[PDB]
Assembly symmetry: D2
Homo-oligomer: 301 residues x 4
């Protein structure tokens, strides 16, 4: 046998950081969950009981906290790039660092209509994430995402004109509920190293905000022909607004809300135009995915 | 043997309802999870295989949807009271109905600074709940609550002066993080029946809003001596603001954030005044409870 | 205002203990999650910022580990009684200790047909639990339980003869699937203190084993008229086999498996006698409860 | 813009099937959760609101149940291959089907030492899974796995000789607890189509059993130098026992159990040789991965 692939590290590292402005009194908090997995000349730890090549996962954990103490933790694209760069530079034999960060929401409270200097609310389980792959000799590959953004619209969703054959029972509809949990990812141009990442720092928060704004407005305003059609519109708009993105990926469950025929009980009318009470379905669910990039077709368009 | 207690019914009934204003176009959505458990002269279903006394749980489910079609689902205190009253009135042999409702958030989206007529966001996993116990001959007992309201303050929390003995390692502190998931319950005066519940309908939304406002403002503004002291202040204020409440209960985890001594690494200072990076602890957690009512002591106060 | 009820302590305390037989080499492991909440003369911690009355939850945590080091952790009824007794004896002003223990399975592996001396498998998420309430001047109240015991039978379950009215759609059946997650609790006679608990120690493991055996055999062998009828049979048998139990409680979800009519597709027959493929329903679910004790009726039986 | 990748289908489809031997009375149950995602000439559903190319996810769901009615559901490698083949053959424009199956345990109960004909227990949350990718013109790629197999050994695990630098605090150890949740995957040689899959059917259950046996015996018997070294031994043995496997992947968390120094309390000794009570750590956790294949090095070995 031989090792074809290997990576190892510390997962589920919870990290909080506070910033205190001593002049104003305003405090700002950041909370995340971090995973760092390393690759390199480590195969003998597996094949030969050679622990000399292992940077202990406990040490990786220590390193995450030390790096958070010595550097900004925001934007997460930057923090992940710093962290990943550290491992490949510090250790000659480590040649890739794979850093995943999940950022948790701590939104400043408004009390009596004024932002409070040191109190926060988890206003959504929506996350902001990064995946930062730092590969020695091949720069820094970053995928940014938002996830867990749960939305519903009560009309202006349709689904008709789909293929009908002997496996089909679904009724066409011109007016349904649409609900999903948005997972949207934007993949950056490869960066050559930490300097190039730093050179684009403002773009990270700005692009996250654009992606979220586009998602919400397109969901709310598109009289939707399908999940497929709506999600494509989101992606094409995000690409148009940030040239340093190469692709946008959406992964969207179709969280079905079924009508309930109550006509068996006193002729109650609760379907079609009279549908008011619905049964949310926990499972199963449609799952619709696509990755959108910029076009390069010049003929047969 | 004999049956000392019995109740049965349908749990985990997911319910959506929409309201459509055909004049304005504005739609409003409600989503909940409902449980109804019945008591009564049902013991022979257990002892004698006598199914004649069983209102099938499937029928209970149907009844939940029919009741939602025929009645408002808001405030949940009202809906639960209607639902529970139905079972004890419809079925001579059923003498109590226990209705639990968890209300899920669907907050209207603002798009380009304007409220959207039919698009919504799950802006928090915080819930609004009721427990409505309709007991034939003894009226309607309602407990209302908010739960899953997750908050953090980064300073203005203290914990010193606690008992110290041979089991104690904890350091006193004059400046710590405080974070919790708020579960707050207000218990109403017994209502004689559905008419009395209906007579107080506006008070339900108003008292929920008061409880939430008091919780947030007291958490944010109290320079806290302990979880115990802070939560008591919340409860006493809610009681002062609604005379139809008899008691207020809080159940609060103390979600610990530990300092990380980094002085072993290059003399880094990350404790006390220089603490910036902390380790959120998933477990264990303090758990602090109290039920507060109005005083009746006239001496030794 | 005044404090009507209060309790506080440490929840979610994970504990492992190993026993090593140095003669034989056999090691045995125990893992649990512990909660201890205290009551007593603590109201001024809430009303007056008086922390002097607080045994810190951090100290409660330390105490759990020290007690596990100094005492057996099995049976959990005993460990909980020791732990709870400690708090009311050590602290004059603490008058009740409420100890909840969840015991996790670590079953010894058999390797090549021989029990291994120090390797274990989590063979089920089923738990064995206790609730031990140590109340000064009123002894020790113990409720023992098994939970998370998930079972299914594919036939020999029926449900017919239930009430039928204008809310009823359910078809009677003489042959269905029955599946549940068993939560079964046996409530012991009050014990006067720790000596009386110790005097009955062998009965704890023996009664847990009886309850589990009765549950499984009655589920498997009863041609069930209903969940209600089957669960009552379980309870009556457990009571007959341990006179120091006062009551047995079951709480059983009815985890529905629906037939799927496929006759619309090529006349496929998948209902009634030809039902082979079913749709497990995640929600909603029936929920059936009862508490059974010994009879005291002497007339009208 | 243009669609660079797309797939869509139905996720979280719960499926039960029973087999009834009418001669013997013995019934056998199977339960799974199925996901099917399709690829093909579907881009216009995203770009042009062209629903004609969509096989509705509701129809995919129907198809899963019809296929389970008409075919064996075991081994899951076979069922997934049948299912996936159906979509690419039935629909000219669909060119790949990606079928994921999670198989749930329903182990036959033994009652009074005899296997019961129709009663089952969920004896573990361990799963048996498949990922079957049916790609038109490129055969059938199958990855089989076991997951959720949670184990612990109380000694015969070590971790010393790892890299030590200014980021390292971890103490070397010659005797520790090792616990993990095993996720093990074996990747089959590409199959040309359904006939070739069928030709190897007995190998699927046999290889799953081998992988599980090797995992448990190697975990129990290896005096482990590291997670890395132990997991490599597992993989190399599985490869040696099934030549139709190309690679074996393990993904193993290191679920840490920390010693608790109690020497501050009455000089209690609970570390090193006297360690009995430990604190299981929920997070963070090491995470150790490798993919092992057969060697092709002929020099510098
Ligand atoms: C109702 N429905 C389907 O049955 N398939 C679809 O995804 O779930 C699909 O492909 N797209 C939808 O928008 N709606 C759907
Ligand atoms: C740090 N700490 C404790 O150790 N006990 C306490 O609850 O968790 C307590 O009783 N009250 C607190 O506010 N803080 C605590
Ligand atoms: C199918 N079914 C019901 O509709 N009600 C019941 O509980 O879920 C009930 O009361 N008892 C059952 O055993 N089966 C049921
Ligand atoms: C204690 N410990 C580490 O700190 N790193 C390791 O994974 O978690 C590692 O690389 N391998 C281990 O077996 N044990 C470890």
């Amino acid at each position: 046998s031989a090792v074809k692939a290997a990576r190892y590290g510390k997962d589920n590292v919870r990290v909080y950081k506070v910033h205190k402005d001593e002049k104003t009194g305003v405090q700002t908090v950041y909370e995340m969950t971090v995973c760092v997995l390393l690759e390199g000349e480590i195969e003998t730890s597996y094949t030969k009981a050679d622990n000399s090549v292992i940077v202990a996962t406990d040490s990786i954990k220590n390193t995450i906290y030390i790096t958070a103490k010595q550097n900004p933790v925001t934007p997460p694209e930057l923090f992940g790039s710093i962290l990943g760069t550290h491992f490949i530079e510090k250790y000659n034999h480590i040649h890739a660092a794979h850093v995943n960060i999940v950022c948790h929401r701590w939104t400043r409270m408004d009390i009596d209509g004024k932002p409070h200097p040191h109190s926060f609310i988890r206003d959504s389980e929506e996350k902001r994430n990064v995946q930062v792959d730092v590969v020695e000799g091949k720069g820094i590959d970053i995928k940014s995402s938002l996830s867990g953004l749960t939305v519903l619209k009560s009309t202006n969703s349709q689904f008709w004109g789909f293929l009908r054959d002997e496996y089909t029972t679904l009724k066409e509809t011109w007016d349904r509920i649409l609900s999903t949990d948005v997972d949207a990812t934007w993949q950056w141009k490869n960066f050559s190293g930490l300097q190039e990442v730093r050179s684009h720092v403002p773009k990270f928060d700005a692009t996250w905000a654009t992606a979220r704004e586009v998602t919400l407005k397109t969901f709310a305003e598109d009289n939707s022909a399908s999940v497929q059609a709506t999600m494509y519109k989101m992606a094409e708009q995000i690409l148009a607004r940030q040239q340093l993105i190469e692709t946008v990926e959406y992964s969207l469950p179709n969280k079905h809300y079924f009508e309930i025929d109550l006509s068996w009980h006193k002729g109650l009318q609760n379907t079609g135009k009279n549908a008011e009470v619905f049964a949310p379905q926990s499972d199963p669910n449609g799952l619709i995915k696509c990755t959108v990039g910029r076009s390069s077709l010049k003929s047969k368009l």
